[PDB]
Design an enzyme around this catalytic site. Structure first.
Site, short mmCIF file in Angstrom:
data_model
loop_
_atom_site.label_atom_id
_atom_site.label_comp_id
_atom_site.label_asym_id
_atom_site.label_seq_id
_atom_site.Cartn_x
_atom_site.Cartn_y
_atom_site.Cartn_z
N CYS A 181 37.23 30.83 31.80
CA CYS A 181 36.67 32.03 32.41
C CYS A 181 37.85 32.87 32.86
O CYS A 181 38.45 32.60 33.90
CB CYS A 181 35.77 31.71 33.61
SG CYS A 181 34.53 33.02 33.97
N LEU A 182 38.21 33.86 32.07
CA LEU A 182 39.33 34.74 32.41
C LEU A 182 38.83 36.16 32.21
O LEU A 182 38.25 36.48 31.18
CB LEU A 182 40.53 34.45 31.50
CG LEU A 182 41.93 34.99 31.85
CD1 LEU A 182 42.47 34.31 33.09
CD2 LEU A 182 42.87 34.76 30.69
#
Length: 148
Positions: A86-87
Site C-alpha cells: 500500500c503505497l
C-alpha cells in the site's frame, strides 16, 4: 509504442547509471515483466536482507502505475502475505513524471519508515503502534529466514 518506448528509455537509463543498493531489469526478454532486488536499510530490522520484487508494467504505462508485488516474505504493516504494497504513488498519487527507480526509492524508505495509517495488515499495524520492540524483533526474525 508510447508504452514500449517509455520502458526502453527507463531500462536504458539504468543500463548506464547503475543504482547502488537497488537492482532491476526485465525477466527473459519480456519488457513488461521485470524483477528487482533490494537490500534492507542499515537502520532497519530488515538490514542485510535481500528482497525480490516482481514488476508488471500496464499496457498504458506511464499513464497508469506499474504493478509491484513482493516475492520475498516480509513482516511489514504496509505489505501483506501476497506481497501487495500500500503505497500512495502506486495508486492515487501516480503520475507520468515518476519512474520505477523513483518507486524503488519510496519503497527502500517505506521499510525504514512504515506507515501505520495504511494498515494493510492490522495485526502487524497494532503491534507496531503499541509494542514496537515485539514488531522489530519479529521483523528481524523473518529477515534471517526469508531475506536471504
Amino acid at each position: 509504442m508510447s508504452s514500449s518506448k517509455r520502458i526502453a528509455k527507463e531500462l536504458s537509463d539504468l543500463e548506464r547509471d547503475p543504482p547502488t543498493s537497488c537492482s532491476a531489469g526485465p525477466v527473459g526478454d519480456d519488457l513488461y515483466h521485470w524483477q528487482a532486488s533490494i537490500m534492507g536499510p542499515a537502520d532497519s530490522p530488515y538490514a542485510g536482507g535481500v528482497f525480490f520484487l516482481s514488476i508488471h508494467f500496464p499496457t498504458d504505462y506511464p499513464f497508469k502505475p506499474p504493478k509491484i508485488s513482493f516475492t520475498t516474505k516480509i513482516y511489514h504493516p504496509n505489505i501483506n502475505a501476497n506481497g501487495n504494497i500500500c503505497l500512495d504513488i502506486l495508486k492515487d498519487q501516480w503520475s507520468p513524471a515518476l519512474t520505477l527507480s523513483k518507486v524503488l526509492l519510496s519503497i527502500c524508505s517505506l521499510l525504514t519508515d512504515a506507515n501505520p495509517d495504511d494498515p494493510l495488515v492490522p495485526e502487524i499495524a497494532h503491534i507496531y503502534k503499541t509494542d514496537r520492540p515485539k514488531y522489530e524483533a519479529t521483523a528481524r526474525e523473518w529477515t534471517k529466514k526469508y531475506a536471504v
